[PDB]
Amino acid sequence: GKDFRTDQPQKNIPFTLKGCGALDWGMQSRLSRIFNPKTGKTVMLAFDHGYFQGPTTGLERIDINIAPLFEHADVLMCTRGILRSVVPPATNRPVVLRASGANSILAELSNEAVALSMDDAVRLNSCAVAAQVYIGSEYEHQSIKNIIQLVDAGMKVGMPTMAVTGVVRDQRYFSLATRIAAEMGAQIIKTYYVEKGFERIVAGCPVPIVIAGGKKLPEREALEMCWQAIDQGASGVDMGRNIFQSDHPVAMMKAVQAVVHHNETADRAYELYLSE
Amino acid sequence: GKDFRTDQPQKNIPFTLKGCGALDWGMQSRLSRIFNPKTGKTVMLAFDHGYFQGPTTGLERIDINIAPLFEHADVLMCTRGILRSVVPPATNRPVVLRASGANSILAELSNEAVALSMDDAVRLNSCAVAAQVYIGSEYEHQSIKNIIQLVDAGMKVGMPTMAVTGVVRDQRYFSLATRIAAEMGAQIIKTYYVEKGFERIVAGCPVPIVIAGGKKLPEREALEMCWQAIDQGASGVDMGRNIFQSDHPVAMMKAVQAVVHHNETADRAYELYLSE
Amino acid sequence: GKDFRTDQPQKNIPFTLKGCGALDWGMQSRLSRIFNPKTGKTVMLAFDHGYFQGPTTGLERIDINIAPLFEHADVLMCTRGILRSVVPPATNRPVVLRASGANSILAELSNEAVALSMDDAVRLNSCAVAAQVYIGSEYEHQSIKNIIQLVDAGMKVGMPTMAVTGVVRDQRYFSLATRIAAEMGAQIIKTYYVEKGFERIVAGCPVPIVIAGGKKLPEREALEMCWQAIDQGASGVDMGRNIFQSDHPVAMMKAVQAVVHHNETADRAYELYLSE
Amino acid sequence: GKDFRTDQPQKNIPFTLKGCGALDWGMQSRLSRIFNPKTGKTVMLAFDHGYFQGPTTGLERIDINIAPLFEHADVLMCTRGILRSVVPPATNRPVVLRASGANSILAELSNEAVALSMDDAVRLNSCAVAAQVYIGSEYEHQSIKNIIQLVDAGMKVGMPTMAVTGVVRDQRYFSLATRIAAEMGAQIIKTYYVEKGFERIVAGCPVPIVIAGGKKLPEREALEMCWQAIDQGASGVDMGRNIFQSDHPVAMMKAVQAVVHHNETADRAYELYLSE
Ligand SMILES: O=C(CO)[C@H](O)[C@H](O)COP(=O)(O)O
Ligand SMILES: O=C(CO)[C@H](O)[C@H](O)COP(=O)(O)O
Ligand SMILES: O=C(CO)[C@H](O)[C@H](O)COP(=O)(O)O
Ligand SMILES: O=C(CO)[C@H](O)[C@H](O)COP(=O)(O)O
């Protein structure tokens, strides 16, 4: 009384996420927590700015202002200090840990060291670990070594590494920064959007790219940036200020989600924003 | 231009999951992937039976019959063999790995060893590891050592361990089995439902309890068992046969969800089942 | 003067080998050395018999009789002893190492221990490690632990493990043995061909299956066995005696290749054998 | 009924690859994947340039432009980033991993660190690891330490190390750079071809030498360079730009193969190129 359905051979289901078709199950799994398998994109809520800036505007009280935003985000990005202290585990949301630091706004910005062991990243159930790369800055060499070290460590354990291109911001520059990081082994790259040439940054990069929100803009303009980035091949956005510094954070997020996952237009989305 | 809201002191949000209020963030995080933070319960789809039974009825073709069920489950339970081979990572669903084995239906059932290293559990992004405890069986001592070893290893890494009471099935017996496992350190206990006294099993166990589906029953009766268990304090169910051996697996799951998360009645639920 | 071809998005190339679509690059790479990416099959030349049998017939002088066969094989299977001593490295052919032993024909056949460290497997540039599983035998439990240990070790390093079902030989039996091994984590399973029901063994096994040659048969019959096995879904054969005990080894191998990779018929192939 | 052929004593088959006749089996095995045992030479397709140069011309889209070349190459050389992301494991071609980096075209070129752990090299099934040595540059000391560290690590595991002489380019200079690297332990040395004295570079180096393609040349001239190098004792070439920057990459590769493995002349080969 058994049915082995032998008339129908077993076939493998392809894993389509850009440049991640040759990774182990666990690593693909963590990546799938970050990039929605359906759309292949992500809306990432970033609040790690304090790691070298202290209580930056809008992030004075993560526990009050940012707490109510978690549920509306695909993934959270922050440090292990904040994570443990004020992000409730019950939030049940994927996290990407800031794993670099030891710099401040009072000194050389590019002077970063690895800020948490892979050991602890695993203890904290991370989906990924993130560090800055500073191409063209004084501590460029060290910043790349930080990426090398996180990748070496993450491959033992199936933890993805996200390289962030920290900074003249033109296409030829970001092409250089993103490609090197990818080349070194980072599975996710986060960079800035550029007025012209962005398409080339995406095309030249073998792995998923995510754009930073950047300094505060009018909500409508912020949404235009997102639409452009997505339309030109970005795999999602990593917003911080353009959300938590808005008068209507939750509304802004829903708009951003509309644009990223559902191919909404900048205008349509802005009207989704005006209804909240 | 900053607002520290100093008139409103920061307060810790309590973690209410039974007997898990004193664990590290990462472990609480993994637990919150299993047990819905809202309802505090879980509907677990179990298909690990093959680990000592080979191609058991209904599990001949996981890739065909079980594949379409994944999305309707809170968490998946299976071996690392099946996980890698036929469970697509894009399933984006929390997993609990069977971590014991080395036994078969052709020999002593209680003769189990640890079947995967914590190393590989982490590599596979697990939410927990599971192993059998056989109180009263020939290899009782070894089975408990399996639990001891998984907890020792899990605590370094923030991985919860689930102890399963494998087997006369009365209340006094399962009280003994579940309590000992909890006492050794397992964070989740999975046991069988009992006609009378089940409430005492839950009350005597300091951590969350989950019931096994058990042998195939008429759908209506299986739902009654769930309702009873939940009503008497279980934290969810770990169904296998009563789902994948049904003529309407997806329908049955929706029913079981209704009973577990939404306090549906056995009858009402059964009518949810008859509509699909 | 650069062309990023931004009109043409990058797409992942699927890895189609049965149940190996969720493995890291290096492991998929080693598997691709074994299973021809085009056909998805393998012809494996096995000469490890001496590991518990001593100088078995046909394998008295590997250096003389077997040496001239290597080039005609897809992959070699043998022990590290023979590998180092008489297989010339310049053979440039992928190897699968026998990694179990400590038994002999003078004692209990199922009493095997792991016979080489993963350390040394990596040192020898192996494509996989192989060990016996003895379901139903006296040392069944230990044999399965051997597989558990090799998988744990292999996963750290991207080395595949092949589980071999050592032994009444019917379908229900081999279904049990193969499925349990796969379930524990082995990426390759090698078993015996069966008169009836073989299709069910393949269908119930989530990873590639390879058949043993078995005791010497008339060349025409051996080819019929291969044809049946392949036709019913096997991923290749692991011949030993039916090749090296033939009066025309090289001829026989070319036949077997014809059947496995090129869908030749038993008869057509036998005529390929009669021309050499 | 056994034949031990005792009238014919067993004899060791010599391993002839220059200066590798005293290595363990595994290491000789990996070297044999790189240097064809028959000819003793190799045609190596190099596309690692991006590791410090970003999207260099011709390598904007490895996945499109370089993908179709793989099959026509003896061995692939690239970074672990590119390997995992866009080189399909099914390519079934030996790889040599770029294992240095942390420099860029925006800073001191000779400032390289080890870019991937031997751990991960083994995980990726490499045939060798490669790093730059910069004799005469500012970070000369560190670059040599990079070779020392890779050799120490490779010897535990049977992984060969390839030292690359990065840079006035005359014979006395490259003799110094190549000889030092070899002396430290590197089993493969890759250097540049020189108008006069190249023969002395080869003679003075105890292990196999491979030449870099160098900047783009007219196809006919590039082939002349290969012919000279081979004729004067090189063990193969590591082309990049002279292939992927050609209007007929595949044709060019076939030509190069002709010259390296089959002792074709520059002219004859060029006519092989004009027919494709
Ligand atoms: O902290 C940073 C890196 O050092 C980034 O500026 C930040 O994480 C990006 O998010 P946003 O610009 O949208 O606030
Ligand atoms: O495999 C088992 C333990 O050895 C269990 O029987 C199983 O996992 C429980 O699920 P169900 O009884 O609902 O099928
Ligand atoms: O050695 C063995 C396992 O203990 C097998 O019998 C052998 O390797 C299979 O090959 P063949 O039966 O074709 O000779
Ligand atoms: O990348 C390099 C070293 O830093 C080399 O220039 C390169 O790998 C050699 O190949 P080619 O000169 O033929 O392009």
Widest pairwise Cα distance in chain D: 74
> Two tokens at C38?
């085009």
Question: Largest Cα–Cα distance in chain A?
Answer: 74
As for chain B, the residues directly before each break of C–N over 2.5 Å are 167
Neighbouring C-beta atoms of residue D22, cutoff 10 Å = 7
Residues C194, C199, C204, C205: what is their CA dihedral angle, to the nearest 10 degrees? 70
Residue B249 identity (one-letter amino acid)? P
Per-residue H/E/C for chain D:
CCCCCCCCCCCCCCCCCCCCCCCCHHHHHHHHHHCCCCCCCEEEEECCCHHHHCCCCCCCCHHHHHHHHHHHCCEEEECHHHHHHHCCHHHCCCEEEECEECCCCCCCCCCCEECCCHHHHHHCCCCEEEEEECCCCCCHHHHHHHHHHHHHHHHCCCCCEEEEECCCCCHHHHHHHHHHHHHHCCCEEEECCCCCCHHHHHHHCCCCEEEECCCCCCHHHHHHHHHHHHHCCCCEEEECHHHHCCCCHHHHHHHHHHHHHHCCCHHHHHHHHHHC
Contact partners, residue A171, CB within 8 Å, separation at least 6: A194, A196, A197, A198, A200, A201
CA dist., res. A135 & res. D209, Å (int):
33
Amino acid present at C264: E
Resolution for this experimental structure (Å):
2.9
Q: Which residue precedes each gap in chain C (C to N above 2.5 Å)? A: 167
Tokens for B155, please give them: 């605590």
What are the CA-CA distances from residue A254 to residues A80, A220, D85 (Å)? Answer: 27, 13, 32
CA distances from C245 to C63, C70, C75, C215, C248 (A): 15, 15, 18, 10, 8
What is the phi/psi pair of residue C91, to 5°? -60, -25
Q: What are phi and psi of A193, to 5 degrees?
A: -80, 145
**CB count, 10 Å around CB of D152?**
12
Q: Which pair of structure tokens corresponds to residue D190? A: 């890759």
CB atoms within 10 A of CB B130: 26
Residues in CB range of A52: below 8 A, 6 or more apart? A101, A103, A104, A105, A109
What is the token pair recorded at A145?
A: 């070594």
Sort residue D58 into left (φ over 0), alpha (ψ -120 to 50) or beta.
left
Which one-letter DSSP state was computed for residue C17?
S
- Using DSSP's 3-state secondary structure scheme, residue B170 falls into coil
B168 C-beta neighbours (distance < 10 Å), count: 6
Q: Give the CA distances from residue B116 to residues B123, B140, B150, C100, C177, in Å, rounded to whole numbers and listed in that order.
A: 11, 20, 10, 19, 19
Q: Which ligand is nearest to the CA of B47?
A: 2
Query: Please, are residues C148 and C184 in contact by the beta-carbon 8 Å criterion?
Result: yes
DSSP states of A205-225 as a string? -SS-EEEE--S---HHHHHHH
Evaluated on CA atoms C161, C163, C164, C167, the torsion sign reads positive
- Cβ atoms < 10 Å from Cβ of B141: 11
What distance in angstroms lies between residue C124's CA and the mean position of ligand 4's atoms?
30
Strands D42-46 and D75-78: parallel
**Do strands B209-212 and B236-239 pair parallel, antiparallel, or not at all (unpaired)?**
parallel
A272 Cβ contact partners less than 8 Å away, ≥ 6 residues apart: A251, A254, A255, A258, A264
Judge residue A265's burial from the number of C-beta atoms within 10 Å of its C-beta, 0-12 exposed, 13-18 middle, 19 or more buried. middle
Q: Is the distance from the beta carbon of residue C40 to the nearest atom of ligand 3 less than 6 Å?
A: no
| Residue B184 and residue B163 in contact, taking contact as beta carbons nearer than 8 Å | yes
Q: A161 has which bridge partners? A: A129
What dihedral do alpha carbons B226, B232, B236, B237 form, nearest 10°? -40
Burial of A166 (0-12, 13-18, 19+ CB in 10 A): buried
Please tell me the distance from the alpha carbon of residue D274 to that of residue C142, in angstroms, as a whole number: 64
Q: HSE (CB half, 13 Å, CA atoms) of C189? A: 34
Sort B21 into a burial class: Cβ within 10 Å, 0-12 / 13-18 / 19+: exposed
- H or E element at residue C106: none
Query: Is residue A178 helix, strand or coil?
Result: helix
How far apart, in whole angstroms, are the C-alpha atoms of residue A255 and residue A270?
Answer: 7
Beta strands C42-46; A209-212: pairing state: unpaired
Task: Please name the helix (run of DSSP H) or strand (run of DSSP E) that holds residue B145, with its range, or none.
Answer: helix B140-157
Spatial CA neighbour of D254 closest among D71, D41, D57, D40: D71
Conformational region of residue A159, where left means phi above 0, alpha means psi within -120 to 50, and beta covers everything else: beta
End-to-end CA gap in chain A:
58
Q: Which residue of C has its CA nearest to A2?
A: C200
Per the listing, tokens 């560090």 go with A131
Q: How far is it, in rounded angstroms, from Cα B144 to Cα B163?
A: 9
In this structure, the number of other CB atoms found within 10 A of the CB of residue C263 comes to 12
Q: What is the 3-state secondary structure (H, E, C) of C223-258?
A: HHHHHHHHHCCCCEEEECHHHHCCCCHHHHHHHHHH
Nearest to B121 by CA among B152, B96, B103: B96
Tell me the C-alpha distance between A19 and A29, whole Å.
14
| Alpha-carbon distances, residue A142 vs B81, B202, B225 (angstroms) | 40, 55, 60
DSSP C12: P
Beta carbons within 8 Å of A205's beta carbon, 6+ residues apart: A178, A179, A182, A189
Which pair of tokens denotes residue D61?
A: 């889209």
User: How many Cα atoms within 13 Å fall on the side-chain side of residue B110?
Assistant: 16
User: D41 in ligand 4 pocket by Cβ < 6 Å?
Assistant: no
Q: Are residues A154 and A118 in contact, defined by beta-carbon separation less than 8 angstroms?
A: yes
DSSP string, A123-157: HTT-SEEEEEE-TTSTTHHHHHHHHHHHHHHHHHH
The answer to whether the beta carbons of residues C235 and C42 sit under 8 Å apart is yes
Residue position matching structure tokens 């794993």: A99
CB B273 within 8 A of CB B248: yes
DSSP H or E stretch at residue A78: strand A75-78
Cβ of B82 within 8 Å of Cβ of C151? The answer is: no
Please state, in angstroms and rounded to a whole number, the distance separating the CA atoms of residues B255 and D75: 57
**Residue whose entry in the numeric block shows the structure tokens 């904040």:** A82
Do the beta carbons of residue C191 and residue C174 sit within 8 Å? yes
Q: Is A243 exposed, middle or buried (0-12, 13-18, 19+ CB in 10 A)?
A: buried
For the record, the structure tokens of A19 come out as 């440049």
Distances (CA, A) of C56 to B230, C59, C87, C114: 63, 6, 18, 22
- How is residue C56 written in tokens? 């078995």
A276 by Cβ neighbours in 10 Å (0-12 / 13-18 / 19+) ranks as exposed
Paired strand residues for B97:
B78, B129
Nearest-angstrom CA–CA distance, C182 and B64: 17
Query: DSSP states of B96-123 as a string?
Result: EEE-EE---TTS-TT--EE-S-HHHHHH
Quick one: DSSP state of residue C74? S
Q: Pairing between strand C113-114 and C100-101? A: antiparallel
- Report the residue from D62, D102, D119 with minimal CB separation from A152: D119
DSSP string, A79-109: -HHHHHHHS-GGG---EEEE-EE---TTS-T
The CATH code for residues D1-276 is 3.20.20.70
User: For A223, left (φ over 0), alpha (ψ -120 to 50), or beta?
Assistant: alpha
The total number of residues shown for chain B amounts to 276
| DSSP tag of C46 | E
Tokens 């590769």 correspond to: D253
Assign 3-class secondary structure to A21-52. Answer: CCCCHHHHHHHHHHCCCCCCCEEEEECCCHHH
Q: Which residues lie closer than 8 Å to B236 by C-beta, 6 or more apart?
A: B35, B41, B42, B43, B44, B74, B208, B210, B211, B230, B260
What span, in angstroms and rounded, lies between the C-alpha atoms of D230 and D237? 8
Q: Which of C73, C47, C72 lies closest to C60 in space, CA to CA?
A: C47
**Which 3-state string (H, E, C) describes C129-186?**
EEEEECCCCCCHHHHHHHHHHHHHHHHCCCCCEEEEECCCCCHHHHHHHHHHHHHHCC
Secondary structure letter of residue B91 according to DSSP: G
Residue pair B24/B15 in contact by the 8 Å Cβ criterion:
no
Reported as type and span, the H/E element at residue A198 is helix A198-203
CA distance from start to end of chain C: 58
| Distance in angstroms (rounded) separating the CA atoms of residues A223 and A239 | 11
Asked whether the beta carbons of A74 and A260 are under 8 A apart, the reply is no
Consecutive H or E run containing B163: strand B161-165
CA D22 to mean position of chain CA atoms = 21
Rounded Cα–Cα distance for residues C265 and D65 (Å): 40
Distance from CA of A144 to the nearest CA of D (A): 5
CA of C9 to the centre of ligand 1 (A): 28
> Could you tell me which of B175, B174, B94 has the C-alpha nearest to residue B129?
B94
Nearest partner of C276 among D2, D38, C258, C213, judged by Cα: C258
Choose among B83, B151, B158: nearest CA to B127. B158
The strand pair at A42-46 and A236-239 is best described as parallel
Burial class (CB in 10 A: 0-12, 13-18, 19+), C209: buried
**How far, CA to CA in Å, does B59 sit from each of A2, B51, C189?**
9, 11, 19
Secondary structure element (H or E) that encloses residue C25, with its range: helix C25-34
Task: Give me the residue spans of the domains in chain A.
Answer: 1-276
Residue burial A212-232, b: 16+ Cβ < 10 Å; e: rest: bbeebbebeebbbbbbbbbeb
- Reading the block at residue B39, the tokens are 């309802």
Token code pair at residue D218:
């007219």
**Interface of chain C against chain D, CB under 8 Å?**
1-5, 8, 10-11, 13, 15, 24-33, 37, 55, 57, 60-61, 63-64, 83-84, 86-92, 122-125, 157-158
Region of B128 on the Ramachandran plot (φ > 0 left; ψ -120 to 50 alpha; else beta): beta
Distance CA D219, CA C222 (A): 53
At a CB cut-off of 8 Å and minimum separation 6, what does D217 contact?
Answer: D225, D242
Catalytic residue among C190, C196, C216, C254: C190
Active site residue C38: no
Q: Going by C-beta distance under 8 Å and a sequence separation of 6 or more, which residues neighbour residue B216?
A: B241, B242, B245
d(CA A82, nearest CA chain B) in Å: 11
Amino acid at B81: G
Q: What are phi and psi of B13, to 5 degrees?
A: -85, 120
Which contiguous run of DSSP H or E holds residue C43?
strand C42-46
Q: Compute CA distances D16 → B153, D31, D202, whole Å.
A: 49, 12, 16
What CA–CA distances, in Å, run from C133 to B53, B79, C3, C166, D39?
15, 18, 55, 6, 42
Q: How far is CA B38 from CA B16, B17, B24, B240, D237, in A?
A: 10, 10, 20, 24, 64
- Beta bridge partners of residue D46, listed in sequence order: D77
Provide the residue type at D144 as one letter: I
B57 burial level (CB within 10 Å; 0-12, 13-18, 19+): middle
Say how many CB pairs under 8 Å bridge A and B.
Answer: 112
Residues of A with CB under 8 A from a CB of D: 19-20, 22-23, 135-136, 140-141, 144-145, 148, 151-152, 155-156, 175-180, 182-186, 200, 203-204, 206-207
The Cα A47–Cα A33 span in angstroms is 19
Size of interface A-C (CB pairs under 8 A): 73
- Which residue in C has a C-alpha nearest to residue D94's C-alpha? C29
